[PDB]
């Protein structure tokens, strides 16, 4: 037996949205670490651009919100979804995108502190990089090549390639976290397979400049989807706003069967001025990119003292944009348990629930989008598009269109249905906000889970359900302006209360005496604490003044009690929270 | 607009002690509030704002002098 | 505009404030409001009701933009 | 108890604040009382020295601070003369401005000096504090008195809007509520050194004086109105270049000062300005009884007391507010690791080792600061019962070639030189060093030279000593040895061949229960020294450590790697850990 080279409470292979999200909470929670990134830079292409709500509120847990909105294209410039024949020519459909319509946009506002953004990958990835520098906690190697694990009983031991110097050497971790992308060696060395369907098509991404403010500002989207009279319905040019007007991504879905030269920079811009349908366009390229469309999710996520999260674990089609969000969510889900853990303050048992807690979340969004990837053909079809028809035939079909016709009428009503659907991607908003935890790091209280009519994929409904998110409320304290979701989490358990609370005083330093983990009691409308100056947090909390909320580092509720007569329940609450033997 | 208040800064509506104690009540004004600006924001193409009448008068006084069908007499 | 007016000083009677009290009197009951008393229940009670009518001013949406004519230059 | 907290903290001036961040950012719920329901409503002291730029830095709001605060560039020198309109006495490079001085400040700290008043401030720190929610503030509450026992204090507690009275119990009290503390009295402490020393009265007030100021850019310009008293000196204060400030004059004892009388105030304004067409309107006007003394001791039990509770002088040096922010600094650390049970009475004794000798040093300094201001005009030949044409005289002959001329000359270029005590003290306002206290000495000699150590700062890893700064680059991110050491934890920085302080830090861990985070530079994958700087100030060699305090001071260092196993039993002495 030797000695390893490296001597590290964690290492983290892959420095991704994933891997780079993990440093930053182990920074933010004191825990030393090592992350090895393969590639010597961060990423060179827009990649994953859509923040969503949640990704917004663990960046202002996390301290980097404010630098990420600096740089995002703000909500207000997302305001559509388009669907059109070229940029230039007559559009065909719209509606209202990422809650900025009428009928979403109060309830977006109520249910999160964060909008919506739009920042892509090569300016989110040395952000992350730049705070994790900033805290020294733990320390970052790009061009270092993950090769191998064994891991036992006390510990995981991996190789490690310099690519630089082709030199290998050893770490040996208390934990692994698998960050390392779409086929995780880390992955393949646990012996776990993903399930789905692979290469189930391929996308052109080609990154271009040109000025198309003529054809964008009077309808603001960050998804235009074209489609040049003349092709198939399964032709379909998507543009992509990444910096209004001015800067785009166009995604084609050439056959499985035709020739992709990713070289081919004059048949590229040949495509995207056709695509346009104004000659007179200046296209300058930036990259072409060929990318290989999966759907699938890994049956398991841990084994043993290795996690994986994010793309290592679910991959799916880029409709929804759902893969960086859930990267982020996976990593925050993690690494408050392993802070606990190697503080010998839980064990396996907490570390089990990340599993548990995030695949349901990982077979949730590959499913819906891979459903939505579908919806997007409804639209051309609903037109009577089909192969086999000339530029003119397809002009034809979106002249008579408006016509007073029972055909006409008839196509009318397939496009309004197939918008409709659209919505699925585009206000998802119970997908993206209301997912909940039915199993992990958390006690049942006993109620029934709350549930109506509305479609769930489309609506959030807030609640303290325990596993639920904590839902979003305004406080004031003194002046100072804060969500329940800023006044909680930050590496801590907090306990909210209200006027007659007194009595969780006493059952929180119990229950901090017997597990060893400080709960925090905030009281809101009481004690000195913050204020709830419009009542929302009183509506919200479903439990009486003198009940209680218990809120877990990472924003999702433990538990929750009516009254003040539970307060006796806490202590044996966190031992099981916690898994504590 | 150009000389107005924008809706935004007009968001709530606060019942005080004094203006530096503590506060004791409010709401969500003229539509700012989560559950009315959606109806806010569909029933018009206009928002609400703040212009004071020794401003919004001069605005109206030149619209009609620029305009020269008609003739204003003041005194 | 003359019931929006009245609503006014439901506030600061919901708080229990009433002629002849002390600044200290009136601090007193701005403090004890969020107690876990059944008084401080009832203010907070009457205080919400007292508030909620303030929507009457803030967000009379109805008013503002939904009076409709019913007999005049129409059919 | 009506409360029980961790922490209870009575005054939310400067140290009071500071001690809530602190604490807020150690993740401590603490509880703050102050008797004003606002915070400061006048400028009072505003001179952030660099050590308090770096303890902002570390609190994490340096950039909110320096976005407000008027840069040191524009306080570039310390300037005498006769009314700001009229001609101009003498004049020194300030505040490490001067050629001479530039490059020792500048390699010194991570951060520069800069002016933020008082007003401006204190609602920085409180916004800072309701933003963690880690503890309360509570403005309009009055601390009446206190008992402590073995095992905490209870403190009774008036909400002076209602009344209504209530008693606090806390394991701790800090003691942060300003001169003629209320706490520091119920301990039976009581101050060393004079009182009522002087009165100042300090006008707050709005003028253009660009016209005489933006040519020779200066925090301080101090005046005499020809045909007055040395004594009857004028100073002016820059808040906001050059249409802001204060003026301060000290009238004697047996003059009648009405703070209400503004048409008086601005009168002399007008008259120490000497241009009846500059515009004065007062803002505020404040009589301030000046005092210099100094605590013999600074707690008692569990109860310390921090800034003006211990400490008062006079304004020259701007010491009291730095010395205050560093008092909170040094106790909070301490307190955290008191309250997780990782360290006694003993570390929490050394509060008062390391910050009374500070205090004493502060209060001697500033004093002499306020003699050296008279011997300008005495040095001019200026006495009582001289007309304005005497005084004038005495300047426009000041430069003839006479004997009589030459040795004034001489005499105002040695009270000049003095001057360098306030204006340039580098030594004094980063070069302290705790001899005594949360430290184990090496065994090496203290570095010393000829140079005054008042006004030269020497960095050094002696133990006691303020970690010196230097430039690392971690990736390509710029970072100062400051910024990647403090935090709320013990570093252990090290260099090539240091990996023998790894398990040496495992140890000290284990048998302390307190964590020493190792970080190797220039080697290991760590920071990197881009100029050689860090190689030259850490006096160990490559394989050698440095053990740097939660407040960023020296607790101990080792020459070479084979010192390694002394290290848990260093640490065990650090926290005065019990035998
Ligand atoms: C070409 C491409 C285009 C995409 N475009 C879109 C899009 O338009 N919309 C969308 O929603 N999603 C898109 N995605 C998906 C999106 O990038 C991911 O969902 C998101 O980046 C989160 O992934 P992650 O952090 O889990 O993994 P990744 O971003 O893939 O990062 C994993 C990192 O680990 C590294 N790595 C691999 N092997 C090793 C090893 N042995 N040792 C160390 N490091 C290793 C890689 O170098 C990489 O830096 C795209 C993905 C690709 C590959
Ligand atoms: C009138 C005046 C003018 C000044 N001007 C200058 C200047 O020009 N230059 C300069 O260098 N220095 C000046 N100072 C000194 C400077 O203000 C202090 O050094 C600095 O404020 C550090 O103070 P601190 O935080 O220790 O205490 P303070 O600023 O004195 O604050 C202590 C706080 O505790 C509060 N308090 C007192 N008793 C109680 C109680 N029983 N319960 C609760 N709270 C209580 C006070 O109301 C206050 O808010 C001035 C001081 C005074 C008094
Ligand atoms: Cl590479
Ligand atoms: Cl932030
Ligand atoms: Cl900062």
Redesign the interface.
Known sequence: GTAPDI?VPVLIVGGGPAGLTAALALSRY?V?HLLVNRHHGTAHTPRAHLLNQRTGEIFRDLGIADRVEAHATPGHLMANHVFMSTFAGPEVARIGAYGNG??????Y??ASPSGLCNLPQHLLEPLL??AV??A??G???FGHEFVSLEQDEHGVTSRITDRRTGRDYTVRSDYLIGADGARSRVLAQLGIALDGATGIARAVTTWFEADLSRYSAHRPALLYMGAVPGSPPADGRVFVSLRPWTEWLHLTFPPPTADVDVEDHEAVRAGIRESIGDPTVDVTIKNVSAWEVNSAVAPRYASGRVFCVGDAVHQNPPTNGLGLNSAVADSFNLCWKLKLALEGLAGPGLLDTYHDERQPVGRQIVDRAFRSMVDLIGIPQALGFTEGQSPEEQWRLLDTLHEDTEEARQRRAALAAATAAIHGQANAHGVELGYRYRTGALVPDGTPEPADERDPELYYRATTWPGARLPHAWL?????R?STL??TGRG?FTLLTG??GEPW?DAARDAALDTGV?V?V?PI???????D???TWAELREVE??GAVLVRPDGHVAWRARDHGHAKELPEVMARVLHQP
């Open positions: 001597r004191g030393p009428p009928d979403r946009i109060g309830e506002r109520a990089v730049e520098q900033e020294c906690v320390q970052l190697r004031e304290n003194g002046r100072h804060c800023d006044v801590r006027p007659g005083r400080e925090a905030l409308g009481a004690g000195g604490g913050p204020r100056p419009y009542g003044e003198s």
